[PDB]
């Protein structure tokens, strides 16, 4: 069972927002209430609504004038169409699923709201009018002399977030990616550190893989050593 998301990543003011949450690999999908939840940077979680397969779409009192949850059960996927997007709506957005467990009969109420046991990994929805920028990466070549360390600098990108891993996805054990700084200009910048030793530093060709999720500009830049 795997929830998967798809959407923009940056939103214009007074403009229309729409997000998708597809369902690959699932044996019991049409039985539940499919939901959406969001969160301001490091703040709390707020509930938008659910759509059961049957078209009974539940919602939230305030967003009554903004939203509508569609269902294209052909995949199946469920879609949210929201209007009047403002900078105050900036934050994390996770699709989810409120489970509905039953014993036999529906209309005689032998089911119950099981819970939002599944969610998405998250896609930021930062509302602005600035420009999205493909990242510019820069080698932080390693120390020459065993153990050493190194990293890679990613500068001038917008908006959040950039996520990476090294060696086509082969290093997530003793790894450190560091926060991004929306520079005074208005562009973020971060770096990512990998704990590489000193011995193989003569025959390899290590690559560093970057994903600026909102810009659709993935990079393979060889981080060549320190002459």
């Amino acid at each position: 069972v795997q929830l998967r998301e798809s959407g923009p990543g940056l939103v214009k003011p007074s403009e229309t927002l729409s997000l998708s949450c597809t369902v690959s690999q699932d044996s019991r999908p049409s039985d539940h209430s499919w939901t959406w939840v969001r969160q301001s940077p490091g703040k709390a979680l707020e509930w938008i609504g659910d759509i059961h397969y049957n078209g009974a779409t539940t919602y939230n009192p305030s967003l009554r004038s903004r939203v509508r949850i569609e269902l294209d059960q052909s995949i199946p996927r469920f879609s949210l169409k929201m209007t009047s997007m403002t900078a105050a709506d900036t934050g994390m957005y996770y699709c989810a699923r409120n489970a509905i467990r039953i014993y036999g009969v529906v209309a005689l109420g032998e089911w119950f709201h099981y819970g939002m046991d599944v969610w998405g990994q998250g896609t930021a929805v930062t509302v602005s009018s600035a420009s999205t920028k493909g990242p510019s990466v820069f080698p932080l070549a390693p120390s020459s002399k065993g153990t050493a360390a190194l990293g890679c600098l990613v500068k001038d990108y917008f908006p959040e977030p950039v996520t990476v891993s090294w060696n086509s996805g082969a290093l997530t054990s003793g790894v450190h990616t560091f926060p991004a700084v929306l520079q005074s200009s208005g562009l973020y910048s971060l770096s990512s550190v990998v704990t590489v030793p000193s011995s193989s530093l003569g025959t390899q060709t290590y690559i560093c893989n970057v994903n600026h999720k909102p810009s659709n500009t993935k990079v393979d830049k060889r981080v060549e050593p320190k002459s």
Partner: protein, 205 residues
């Protein structure tokens, strides 16, 4: 909204309570979720029928029982419940469980000079990164040679790592003209009255 305490901490091994309270609890069940800073929240209390967690009902409230806490549980616990009309579901204010007396981890600092390419693209963004410290409180300064820097320094804030400690970054935005101009660049980071300084140059390597 549903009522939670802002924080209940406790010493390792003992029991910490985290309660929910509100208007639907006299007729509806109470669900629970735990989020580490920026992580996806972790469901713990489920609507079973008609291993270190438990939530206890009592009239207009439901009390969680975290018996024997650890550093892995230092996060935010949000309670959740359905409405009595069931027309909505809602969350609580977030209880930050803190594990008391966790060891005071010193800072670990890494300083890099600008790359071969960035100095050709007319930027010199020095990279001074900090890892594996506790608690969330670091004070950083910048020195050019032995003379501090005023304008060009931006920094982020402590973020919890994979090991329940915090990490952060620091950058200095200079031109390629101001990076070979001096003689050295030094990053200096205080932590609970303890610091370290790293020295690079445009002539060493």
């Amino acid at each position: 909204e549903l009522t939670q305490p802002p924080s209940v901490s406790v010493s390792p091994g003992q029991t910490a309570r985290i309660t929910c309270s509100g208007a639907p609890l006299t007729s509806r069940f109470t669900y629970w979720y735990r989020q580490k800073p920026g992580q996806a929240p972790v469901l713990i209390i489920s609507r079973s029928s008609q291993g270190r967690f438990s939530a206890s009902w009592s009239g207009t409230t439901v009390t969680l029982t975290i018996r024997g806490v650890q550093a892995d549980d230092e996060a935010d616990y949000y309670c959740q419940s359905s409405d009595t009309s069931d027309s909505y579901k809602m969350f609580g204010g977030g209880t930050k469980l803190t594990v008391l007396g966790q060891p005071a981890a010193a800072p670990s600092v890494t300083l890099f000079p600008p790359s071969s390419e960035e100095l050709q693209a007319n930027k010199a963004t020095l990279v001074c990164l900090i890892s594996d410290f506790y608690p969330g409180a670091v004070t950083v300064a910048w020195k050019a040679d032995s003379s501090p820097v005023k304008a060009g320094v931006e920094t982020t804030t402590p973020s919890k790592q994979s090991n329940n400690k915090y990490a952060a970054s620091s950058y200095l935005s200079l031109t390629p003209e101001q990076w070979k101009s001096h003689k050295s660049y030094s990053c200096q980071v205080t932590h609970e009255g303890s610091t370290v300084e790293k020295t690079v140059a445009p002539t060493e390597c």
